[PDB]
Structure 1
Amino acid sequence: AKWVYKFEEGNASMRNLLGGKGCNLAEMTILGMPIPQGFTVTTEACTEYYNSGKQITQEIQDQIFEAITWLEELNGKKFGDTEDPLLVSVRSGARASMPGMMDTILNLGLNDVAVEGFAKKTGNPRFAYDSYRRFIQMYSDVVMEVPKSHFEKIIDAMKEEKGVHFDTDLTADDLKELAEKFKAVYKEAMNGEEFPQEPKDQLMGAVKAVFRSWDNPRAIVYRRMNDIPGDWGTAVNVQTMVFGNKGETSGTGVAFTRNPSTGEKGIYGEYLINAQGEDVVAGVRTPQPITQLENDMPDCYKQFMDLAMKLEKHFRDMQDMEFTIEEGKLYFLQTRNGKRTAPAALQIACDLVDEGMITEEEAVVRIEAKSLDQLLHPTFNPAALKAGEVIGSALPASPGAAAGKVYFTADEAKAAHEKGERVILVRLETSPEDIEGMHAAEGILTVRGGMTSHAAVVARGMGTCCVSGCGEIKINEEAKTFELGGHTFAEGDYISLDGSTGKIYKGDIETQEASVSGSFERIMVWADKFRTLKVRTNADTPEDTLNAVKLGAEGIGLCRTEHMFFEADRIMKIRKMILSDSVEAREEALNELIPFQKGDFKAMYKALEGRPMTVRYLDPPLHEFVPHTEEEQAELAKNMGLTLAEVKAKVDELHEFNPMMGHRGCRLAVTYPEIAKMQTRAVMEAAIEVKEETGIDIVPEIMIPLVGEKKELKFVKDVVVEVAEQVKKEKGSDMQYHIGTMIEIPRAALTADAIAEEAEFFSFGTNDLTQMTFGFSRDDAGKFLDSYYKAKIYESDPFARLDQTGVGQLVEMAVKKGRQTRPGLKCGICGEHGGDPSSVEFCHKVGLNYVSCSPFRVPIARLAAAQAALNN
C-alpha cells in the first residue's frame, strides 16, 4: 500500500492515519509556517508491523528510505553522510495526544564518521560532539532501555571531575570523550554489540522501537486510564533537524497560548538558551519563563507570538507549541490543542465564545467531561492553611490541595494507596515508568523540572496537584528520606502541597468541600440548553440530596433503603422479625420500624420539594442483618428469650453459597410480603403528610429490585398497590404513584416487553447487570482483572465503563421491548456507569430518559449528556 506521506500530502482530517502530531505538522506546513520538512510513517504501518509477527515489511522500509531520499534532495545533503550529513528527528504520535508518554530521538544520523563531517561543515566541534552524545543517549534510552541513570552518572562524574558546573561548560574535547563513554555504556549493555553506525539501521531501529513501545506495559495501562483503544496504533514522524544547541543565539522552548492550569489568556511556558528540548523538560538549568525571551531575543519573540496567535486562530483553541531557534531563526516543531485542567477548560471555552471565536455548541463539545471531577476536589480549609507550617515552595505546576504520606518510588506509592493511604510521590523528576504511582497519588512533588516537566504535564492531565522544581529538597532514595527546611522526612510522613501557590507544608493540612466558578455555571447553562437526557442523583439522605440539587440534579434515581434497617436504632426490629416463627410476629416486629422509616422519608420529601425520587425496596438477603459475632448473637438471644444455640441455628439457616444470587430482593418480598407492605406504608404515609404540610405535590416512585419474570413483579406490585390504596383511603388522599423495577437480571431485559406490562418505569441497575452478564462478582474479580488488563483481554474496567458491546445489548433491548408494550415507559440508569461519560452517551443514544449518578458526579453527567445530544 502507501505507508508514508510527506507533510505536504496531509492535513488535520487525516488524523487517524497520520496521528495527531503528523496531521498537525501537515496542517502547519499547509499554512506555510517555518516547519522543517519531513514525513510520516502511518498508523496503518504500525498495524501492518503487528500483523507481520512484529516486523517491518520490505515494502514499508522501501518507502521510508524512499522518503529519506526525498528529504536529501530538498536539503542537498545525504542522510548521515560521512561528509556533510543530514540528521533527523524521529518522533512517535497516535491519533490521540498522550503528553509525557511518547518518544523523541534527536540527531539521528550521527556516527563515528558523520560527526567529524558535521563538525567541519558547521565549523563547530563542540556542537557536533554535544549533538552526538545526546543522540547516543536518547537512542540507548528509547530503542533499548538503558536508564538515563547510567548516562547522567557519567556526565556528572566528568563535570564534577573537571570542576565545571554546567553541561554547557564542557569542551569539544570532553564531549568526544563523553560520547565514547556513552557508546561504551550501550555496548556494556548490548551483550557486546556496538552502537549502530549505519544511518539506515538507526532509522529502522528507532521506527521499530516506536511500534514495539505501543505494547509496553506502561502504554497499555496509561491507555486504559485515558480510554484509548489499542488498535489505533501510532505513527512515526521523521523530520530534518533544527538545533537550539548551536550557540548563544540558539534555543528551544515549549509554550501554551493560554495558561493550562487556570485558563487565563496569555502566553505561558518556558525555554532555555543553547539547549535541546530534553534540557528544558529536565530543569537542571532553571528554565526561563517564556515571557522573558522578549528580553533576550525581541525579534524572534515578536515572530513567535504572531505565529502563536495565528495557530490558536486557525485551530480555534488554546495551543501547546514547541519551537526551536537556530542561530536567530525561528522554527515551529509541533502544535496541538493543549491539555488542561477542568477550571482552565471552562475559562478558556468561555473566553473563546465571548471573543466570537467559537460557538456555545463548540465550547460544550470540546471540554473533557471526565475532567470535571476536579472541580469537586476538596480545597484546603483557609484557616488551617494560614496556621500551617510552610517548609518550602516551588512551581505551582498543577493545581489542587494534596495531603498525604510520602513515598519515593511510583511502586511504593501505589502499593501504599492500595492499602488505603493518601500518598504523596516525591521524586527527583518523574518518567513514563512512574505513571501508575502518579495516578495513585494525591499529589506530586519534585526536585527538578518546570511547568513543562514530565510531572507537570502528566499531572495537569490527571487533574492532580503538583509542585515542581523544589531545589531545596534533598532526597536520599536508599534511606527513603528527604530533607527540606527545618527537617528530614521519612517514608510515610505527612506533607501537604498547594498546587496553586507552590507552597509545601509539614503535616496533613485540613481540607474542606470546594465551591464553583461562573464559567462552570455558564458552561452548565449552555449544556442544559442542548441536553435532552435529564440527570438525577443517587442519594440516600437529605444532605446528599441538597448537594446534588445544588450541582444541577433534577431529582433522585436511586434512594437505597438498607440503612433504614441497619441503623443502631433499627437493626433490632429486623433482627426480631428474622428470628420470629409467625407471619404475625414478623408483621408486629416490622411495624415497629414504621415510625422510623416514615421519618426518614418525610425528611427526604421535605428536602426534595417536589422533585421525584425512585425508592428501591429492600435489596440484600436476611443474613446481612443477623449478627455474625458469637457475642452479638448472644446479646440477641438474650433480648429475645432464645438460647445462643437457637440464634446460631437461624443464622446458619440463612447462610448462602452465593449471596449475590440467593434469597433477596423481589424473591424475599414474595416469601415475606410483610416487608414490602411496611416499606409501602412508610413511603406513602410520609409522602401524603409532606404533601399536606406543603401543598407541594409528590408522585412516589417505588422500585422493586432483582426481578426476572413478569408474574414475579406482579405478585409484589399487587401487595404494594393494596397497601398504597389503603393508606390513601385512611388519609383521604388521591396521590398518584408509580411502581417500577430495576433491570438488573439478564432475564428482565430479555423479557422486558412482558415486564413492562406491570412495570411503570425501568431503572437499569448496571452494576449487577454487568456482574450477571459477565458472570463475575466485582469483589472477587480483582484476582484476574489485572492480569486481563495487562494481557489486553479487556481495555476498560466493566464496572466503571458500560460494556457497550455486550451489556449494552441488554440495556438497548430492554428499552426497545419495554416500549413495545408501554410506549411512554420511563427508563433510567443508576449503576456507577450513570456518572461515566461514554456510558451516558450510550444511554442517550438508546433512548433512556435520564441518568443518575452520585451527587459529586452530577456536573460530569450533565455535560456528558449535552455532548451526547450534540454528537448524535
Structure 2
Amino acid sequence: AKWVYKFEEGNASMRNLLGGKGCNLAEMTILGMPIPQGFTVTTEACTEYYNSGKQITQEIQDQIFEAITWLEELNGKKFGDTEDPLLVSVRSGARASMPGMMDTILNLGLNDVAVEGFAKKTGNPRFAYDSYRRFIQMYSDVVMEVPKSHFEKIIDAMKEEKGVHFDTDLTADDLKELAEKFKAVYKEAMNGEEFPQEPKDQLMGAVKAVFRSWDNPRAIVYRRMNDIPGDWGTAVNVQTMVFGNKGETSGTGVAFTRNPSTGEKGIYGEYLINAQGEDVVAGVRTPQPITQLENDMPDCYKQFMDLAMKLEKHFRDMQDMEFTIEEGKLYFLQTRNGKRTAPAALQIACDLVDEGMITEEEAVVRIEAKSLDQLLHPTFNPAALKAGEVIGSALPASPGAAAGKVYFTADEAKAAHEKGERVILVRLETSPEDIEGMHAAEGILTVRGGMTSHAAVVARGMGTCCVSGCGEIKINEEAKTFELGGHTFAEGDYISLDGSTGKIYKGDIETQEASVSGSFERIMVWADKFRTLKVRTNADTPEDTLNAVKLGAEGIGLCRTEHMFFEADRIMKIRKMILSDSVEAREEALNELIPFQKGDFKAMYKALEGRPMTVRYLDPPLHEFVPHTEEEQAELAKNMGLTLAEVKAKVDELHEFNPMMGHRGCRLAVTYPEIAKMQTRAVMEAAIEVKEETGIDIVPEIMIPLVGEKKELKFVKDVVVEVAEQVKKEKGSDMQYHIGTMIEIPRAALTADAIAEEAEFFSFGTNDLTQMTFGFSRDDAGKFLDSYYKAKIYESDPFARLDQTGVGQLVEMAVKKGRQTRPGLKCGICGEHGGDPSSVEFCHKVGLNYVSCSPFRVPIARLAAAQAALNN
C-alpha cells in the first residue's frame, strides 16, 4: 500500500521515492509556488510493476484513480468529462535527472466528446482542437512509438495547402480535421485499434508506458553512460494542466538562472507565446530568448524572475526551470539543479561561494568530477580558425571545438566512430533514440531547435560541442547530404563547429591544448584542501610528467619501462639478448641497454625534481620483442649471423597460447634475473647522478609486476637489492630506495600479508586484477560485453569503472592484510580505474594512500579525491 503521493505529501528529501521531478514539484508546492496540483506514482510502484510480470497491480490502479478523484474535487472538474473536462499532464522522472530522455504527455483526458465540452467551456474551439491534436500525437509517440514524423508529415501537408506558414495559422476546422487525421494514424498503425477514448484508459496507458520505457534499450545504454543504476526505477507525475496555447497572452518556456554552457550569472533560456513545451524544444517557430519576455509581458517576467531567484537561493544551486503563462498568469511546472558543462560548474560553484550562498565544501562536493575531462578537450588553434572558411552560423548550445566527418543518423555516426573516425552528427534535430550516436560524435549540428532543444541539452550533458538551429541547412536524408552556404556536403566530408561562437566551418580545423579556467585552479585549491589521497600520474616521459605536475600530479605512480626496450635504438639489444644461448651473452646484450635507459631515467628525475616515481619493471613476455614478420626476422638473422630458420624457431619457441597469462613480469625476471639487475643499474645510476647534479633527494621506487607469491617477489627483490647496493657502493651513495610490488594477480591480494613482508609498497594494477578476477581479457571481451550491457547483466564497464563488489573485495583485503605485516605500507592504484571518480572514492574509503591516472585525468582524481574525503 501507499503507491501514490500528492505533491503536498512530499518534499525534496523523498527523491528516491518521488524521483527528481516529483520531489521537486512537492518542494515547490511546499514553498507555496504557483505549481498546478497533482500527484506522483512512486519509483516503488515501478519496481512493483516489474515484480508483477510488467503489469500494473490492482492496488496501484486503485490508488491512481483514487488520486485522480482528489484532483477532480480540488478542481471542480471531472477527469476527461464530456462537459467541463479536467485534463492532466503525465511526466516520468527518476531519482537521477536524465534531461532529454524522459517522457511528457500533455492534455491527457481529451477525447471525441470531452474536446467539445472543452471548446464549449473555454469558448475557444481552435484552442480545444489544438490541444486534442497535440495529445493524439504525444500519446501515439510516448505510449506506442508512432514516429513524430507521421504527424509532422500530416500537419505539413495541411499547412502547405491551406497556404499557411505556421501552426499558429490553423483554423479550429483545420485542427478538428487534423485531429481526425492524427487519430487515423494511431489506428492505421495499431492493428486497427482506435485511439483510447476513455480518460482512465489513457491515464493507465501512459503510466504503464513510462515504466515499460524504463527498460527501453535506449534508457539502458543511457544509464550506463551516466552510471545510473537500473533498479532505481522511475516515478510518474500527474498534474492538472495549464495551457500556454490558449492564446496571445499565453506561452511556455525553459530557463536556467545562470548560463549552463559558460556558468555566467543571469537568466538563460527561451520561450514561445501561444504554444506548449513541444514547440519550444522543436524550434519550428524560432524560440525567443528568455530575456525578451520582459518586452512581451513585463509583469509575468518580473514575477518569473523573482520566483527563479527564490528557487536558486532555496536549492542553493543554479536552477533549470519550466514555466507556462496561461492568459497572463504564471505557473511553474518543474525546477531541478541544472546540468552544465565543466567550465560552467566551476564558474558557478565559485560565484555561489563568493555571494555567501554555499560553502567551499558544498561547492566541491557539488561538481560532477567526471565532467572535468571536458576542461582539457583540445580547443581550436586561433590561426587555423581565423583562416577557417565559415560556411554558416547558429546557436552555440554546448561549447567545444569539434571537427570530424559528417553522418546523418546516430547509427551511422556511432559505427563510423568505431572504425576510428572523428564524427559530426548533422540532424534536423535529435531524439532519445540518437543518444549513443550523439555520444560517439565530436560535435552535433542541428537544423532546428535552440538552447533548450534535445541536442543542446543532451550535449551540454555529454560535454560535447553543438551548434543548433542552423535553419540555413537543407538536409537530404535520402541522399545523405546537406546544403549550407557555399556547398553540398556528402557523408564523410569534414566540417568543424565551434559550440562557443556557433560558427560552422568547411573542413577540418586544427586544434591545440586547452588552458585552464581560474575557478578551476580555485576548486582545485579547495579540492586539495579537503582531499587526503595524494594524486600521482601514469607518465612514461618528461613531457607527460610536466603536464601532469602542471595539473596537480604530486609525482608518478607508474612509469612503464617497455618503450625503453621497444624503441628503434633499443629493440636489437633485447633481440640479441633473446637469441643468445648464454647467461653471459644475455648479460652483455642487456648491459648494452644501460646507457640508453639510464638516460631515459635521468631525464625523468630531472623533470621530477624530487617527486616520487614508481618504476615498473619489464611487463611483457619475450615474444613481444622478437620480429613477427618473416622479413624482419630475416634481417634479425642477418644481424646476428643466424639462419632465418633459427630465428623462426626461437620466435616459435617463445610463442604462447595466452600471452596475457604466460612467461612475463616477475616470472620472466625469475628465469632471467639479468633483466631486473640491468633495469636496476639503469634506475639507480640515473638517480644517484641526477642527485649528485641537483642535490635534490631521490628515493627510487622499484615495482615488480605480475606477482602472486611472497617468495617469488623475494627472489627478484634480492636480485635488485644486490645490484642497487652495488651501484651505491661504486658511487659512494647513501641513497635510499624502496622495492614494492604490483598487486594485480588475485593470489597477491589473498596473500598480501605474506607479500607485504617483502614488498615495501603495493600498487594496484587494476586492469590486470580486473581481467583475472573476471576471468577475461579486455581485448576479447568486446564480443559479449555489449550483449551483457543490453541485457542488463552488467550496468558498468569493469575496465572503466572499478567493480567494487568483486574486484573491490581483493583491493580492500590486500591493503588490510598487507598492513597486518607492514602497518605503514603505502598503497596506490594505477590501472585505468585510478581516474574514475567512484573508483577513486572506493580507494579513498579502503585506505589507499594515493591514486594515479593519466596526466589529463589528474584534476578528475584530485576533485574525486576531495569529494571522497568530504562525502565520507
TM-score (norm 1): 1.00
- Cα distance, 1:41 vs. partner? 0.3
| Separation in 1, partners of 2:148, 2:518 | 45
- Cα distance, 1:554 vs. partner? 0.2
- Cα distance, 1:469 vs. partner? 0.2
- Cα distance, 1:6 vs. partner? 0.3
| Separation in 2, partners of 1:812, 1:372 | 27
| Separation in 1, partners of 2:82, 2:803 | 56
2:478 aligned counterpart, secondary structure: coil
| Separation in 1, partners of 2:822, 2:796 | 34
- Cα distance, 1:210 vs. partner? 0.3
CA offsets 1:729-754 (integer angstroms, 9 cap, x no match): 00000000000000000000000000
1:220 corresponding residue in structure 2 = 220
2:570 aligned counterpart, secondary structure: helix
CA offsets 1:645-687 (integer angstroms, 9 cap, x no match): 0000000000000000100000011000000000000000000
| Separation in 1, partners of 2:715, 2:2 | 66
- Cα distance, 1:774 vs. partner? 0.3
- Cα distance, 1:562 vs. partner? 0.2
- Cα distance, 1:335 vs. partner? 0.3
- Cα distance, 1:641 vs. partner? 0.5
- Cα distance, 1:494 vs. partner? 0.2
CA offsets 1:91-119 (integer angstroms, 9 cap, x no match): 00000000000000000000000000000
Q: How does 1:309-324 map to 2 (within 5 A)?
A: 309-324=309-324
RMSD between aligned residues: 0.3
2:365 aligned counterpart, secondary structure: helix
CA offsets 1:475-530 (integer angstroms, 9 cap, x no match): 00010000000100000000000000000000000000000011100000001110
- Cα distance, 1:21 vs. partner? 0.3
- Cα distance, 1:31 vs. partner? 0.3
Q: Does 1:831 align with 2:831?
A: yes
1:763 aligned counterpart, secondary structure: strand
2:526 corresponding residue in structure 1 = 526
- Cα distance, 1:597 vs. partner? 0.2
| Separation in 2, partners of 1:133, 1:452 | 23
CA offsets 1:756-781 (integer angstroms, 9 cap, x no match): 00000000000000000000000000
2:569 aligned counterpart, secondary structure: helix
Q: Does 1:663 align with 2:678?
A: no
Percent of aligned pairs with the same amino acid: 100
2:79 aligned counterpart, secondary structure: coil
TM-score (norm 2): 1.00
1:27 corresponding residue in structure 2 = 27
| Separation in 2, partners of 1:646, 1:28 | 80
| Separation in 2, partners of 1:221, 1:70 | 38
1:697 aligned counterpart, secondary structure: coil
1:292 aligned counterpart, secondary structure: helix
- Cα distance, 1:131 vs. partner? 0.3
| Separation in 2, partners of 1:642, 1:302 | 89
2:105 aligned counterpart, secondary structure: strand
| Separation in 2, partners of 1:638, 1:537 | 41
1:184 aligned counterpart, secondary structure: helix
CA offsets 1:194-246 (integer angstroms, 9 cap, x no match): 00000000000000000000000000000000000000000000000000000
- Cα distance, 1:52 vs. partner? 0.2
Over 4 Å off, 4+ runs = none
- Cα distance, 1:307 vs. partner? 0.5
CA offsets 1:228-286 (integer angstroms, 9 cap, x no match): 00000000000000000000000000000000000000000000000000000000000
- Cα distance, 1:815 vs. partner? 0.2
- Cα distance, 1:446 vs. partner? 0.3
CA offsets 1:607-666 (integer angstroms, 9 cap, x no match): 000000000000000000000000000001000000000000000000000000100000
| Separation in 2, partners of 1:442, 1:756 | 46
| Separation in 2, partners of 1:675, 1:148 | 66
Q: How does 1:126-141 map to 2 (within 5 A)?
A: 126-141=126-141
CA offsets 1:359-384 (integer angstroms, 9 cap, x no match): 00000000000000000000000000
| Separation in 2, partners of 1:440, 1:375 | 18
- Cα distance, 1:536 vs. partner? 0.1
CA offsets 1:576-623 (integer angstroms, 9 cap, x no match): 000000000000000100000000000000000000000000000000
- Cα distance, 1:4 vs. partner? 0.3
**Consecutive unaligned residues in structure 2, runs of 5 or more:** none
| Separation in 2, partners of 1:511, 1:353 | 33
| Separation in 1, partners of 2:130, 2:388 | 46
1:704 corresponding residue in structure 2 = 704
- Cα distance, 1:292 vs. partner? 0.1
| Separation in 2, partners of 1:485, 1:518 | 38
| Separation in 2, partners of 1:585, 1:647 | 16
- Cα distance, 1:344 vs. partner? 0.4
- Cα distance, 1:338 vs. partner? 0.3
CA offsets 1:396-445 (integer angstroms, 9 cap, x no match): 00000000000000000000000000000000000000000000000000
| Separation in 2, partners of 1:53, 1:384 | 59
2:46 aligned counterpart, secondary structure: helix
- Cα distance, 1:861 vs. partner? 0.2
| Separation in 1, partners of 2:198, 2:504 | 50
CA offsets 1:821-852 (integer angstroms, 9 cap, x no match): 00000000000000000000000000000000
| Separation in 2, partners of 1:474, 1:58 | 51
| Separation in 1, partners of 2:100, 2:667 | 53
- Cα distance, 1:394 vs. partner? 0.2
| Separation in 1, partners of 2:785, 2:188 | 38
- Cα distance, 1:317 vs. partner? 0.4
2:85 aligned counterpart, secondary structure: coil
| Separation in 2, partners of 1:306, 1:721 | 71
| Separation in 2, partners of 1:553, 1:758 | 28
| Separation in 1, partners of 2:156, 2:668 | 72
1:13 aligned counterpart, secondary structure: coil
1:569 aligned counterpart, secondary structure: coil
1:12 aligned counterpart, secondary structure: coil
**Consecutive unaligned residues in structure 1, runs of 5 or more:** none
CA offsets 1:55-90 (integer angstroms, 9 cap, x no match): 000100000000000000000000000000000000
| Separation in 2, partners of 1:198, 1:645 | 83
| Separation in 1, partners of 2:712, 2:58 | 65
| Separation in 2, partners of 1:740, 1:496 | 48
- Cα distance, 1:347 vs. partner? 0.4
| Separation in 2, partners of 1:313, 1:573 | 67
Q: How does 1:359-378 map to 2 (within 5 A)?
A: 359-378=359-378
- Cα distance, 1:156 vs. partner? 0.1
- Cα distance, 1:783 vs. partner? 0.1
- Cα distance, 1:797 vs. partner? 0.1
1:420 aligned counterpart, secondary structure: coil
CA offsets 1:518-562 (integer angstroms, 9 cap, x no match): 110000000111000000000000000000000000000000000
| Separation in 1, partners of 2:446, 2:315 | 33
| Separation in 2, partners of 1:154, 1:233 | 35
- Cα distance, 1:309 vs. partner? 0.5
- Cα distance, 1:799 vs. partner? 0.1
| Separation in 2, partners of 1:529, 1:264 | 25
Q: How does 1:441-452 map to 2 (within 5 A)?
A: 441-452=441-452
| Separation in 1, partners of 2:309, 2:674 | 71
CA offsets 1:2-57 (integer angstroms, 9 cap, x no match): 00000000000000000010000000000000000000000000000000000000
1:161 aligned counterpart, secondary structure: coil
- Cα distance, 1:726 vs. partner? 0.3
- Cα distance, 1:694 vs. partner? 0.3
1:204 aligned counterpart, secondary structure: helix
